[PDB]
Amino acid sequence: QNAQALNTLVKQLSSNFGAISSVLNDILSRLDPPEAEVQIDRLITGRL
């Protein structure tokens, strides 16, 4: 059960949660802050 809980938690990092990408660095390397922040907030809400 504990292994499953951790594996689930890690797999969630691959989710977009409405963002253009699950990868945080790919958002930052592509968008200027005024737009990057929106995509990041979507990931923060999902990951939090």
Told to check if 44 binds other proteins by CB under 8 A, we report no
Residue of 17, 18, 19, 22 that binds other proteins (CB under 8 A): 22
DSSP, collapsed to helix, strand or coil, labels residue 7 as helix
| Secondary-structure breakdown of the chain: helix, strand, coil percentages, each rounded to the nearest 5 | 70, 0, 30
Told to check if 38 binds other proteins by CB under 8 A, we report no
Told to check if 18 binds other proteins by CB under 8 A, we report no
Up-side HSE of residue 35: CA atoms within 13 Å toward CB? 8
- Considering the complex, state which of residue 1 and residue 32 has its C-beta at the smaller distance from other proteins: 32
Told to check if 10 binds other proteins by CB under 8 A, we report yes
